[PDB]
């Protein structure tokens, strides 16, 4: 269950994830190296995560890099998904090893509407600097993310 539950979120199968969510299983069971079926979610998935989440699933766990699915959702873009992890109660302000936030992932890759729903719609820390001493917009300048950077300082 466990490890076929993470097969199934991971190659993005809601049909299959259904179908092993009619067992008596443990959405938060880690597979064979260590992450649960919500951390190798195929993202682009907002389906599989509220299915996930709707058992019980943490969507706070870190992996072997302290990056929890809400920041992999924020690097990748994927609003949908983030979305859907906060209407979960999931951290937007949880932090990786580097003292990045979910905000300063989508805003160094240039996800502007990630970047908006974060300052405009959630308790994200626009002005958390990282632990190099850098926040989400000054990671948006370094790699030249301008519309990410007008956004920003337009509204916070």
Same mark, same amino acid.
């Given at each position: 269950?466990?490890?076929?539950?993470?097969?199934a979120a991971?190659?993005?199968?809601?049909?299959?994830?259904?179908?092993?969510?009619?067992?008596?299983?443990?959405?938060?069971?880690?597979?064979?190296?260590g992450?649960?079926?919500?951390?190798?979610?195929?993202?682009?998935?907002?389906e599989?995560?509220?299915?996930?989440?709707l058992?019980?699933?943490n969507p706070?766990?870190k992996?072997?890099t302290?990056?929890?699915?809400? +920041?992999?959702?924020?690097?990748?873009?994927?609003?949908?998904?983030?979305?859907?992890?906060?209407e979960?109660?999931?951290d937007?302000?949880?932090?990786?090893?580097?003292?990045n936030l979910?905000?300063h992932?989508?805003?160094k890759?240039? +996800?502007?509407?990630?970047?908006?729903?974060?300052?405009? +719609?959630?308790?994200?820390?626009?002005?958390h600097?990282?632990?190099?001493?850098?926040?989400?917009?000054?990671?948006?300048?370094?790699?030249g993310?301008?519309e990410?950077?007008?956004?920003?300082?337009?509204?916070?």
């Open positions: 269950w466990g490890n076929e539950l993470a097969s991971a190659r993005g199968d809601l049909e299959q994830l259904t179908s092993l969510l009619q067992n008596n299983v443990n959405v938060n069971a880690q597979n064979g190296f992450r649960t079926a919500l951390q190798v979610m195929k993202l682009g998935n907002p599989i995560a509220r299915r996930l989440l058992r019980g699933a706070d766990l992996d072997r302290g990056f929890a699915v809400i +920041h992999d959702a924020a690097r990748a873009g994927q609003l949908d998904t983030l979305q859907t992890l906060l979960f109660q999931a937007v302000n949880i932090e990786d090893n580097e003292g979910p905000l992932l989508a805003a890759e240039g +996800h502007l509407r990630v970047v908006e729903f974060l300052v405009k +719609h959630t308790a994200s820390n626009v002005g600097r990282n632990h190099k001493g850098d926040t989400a917009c000054d990671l948006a300048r370094l790699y993310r301008n990410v950077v007008s956004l920003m300082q337009a509204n916070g």
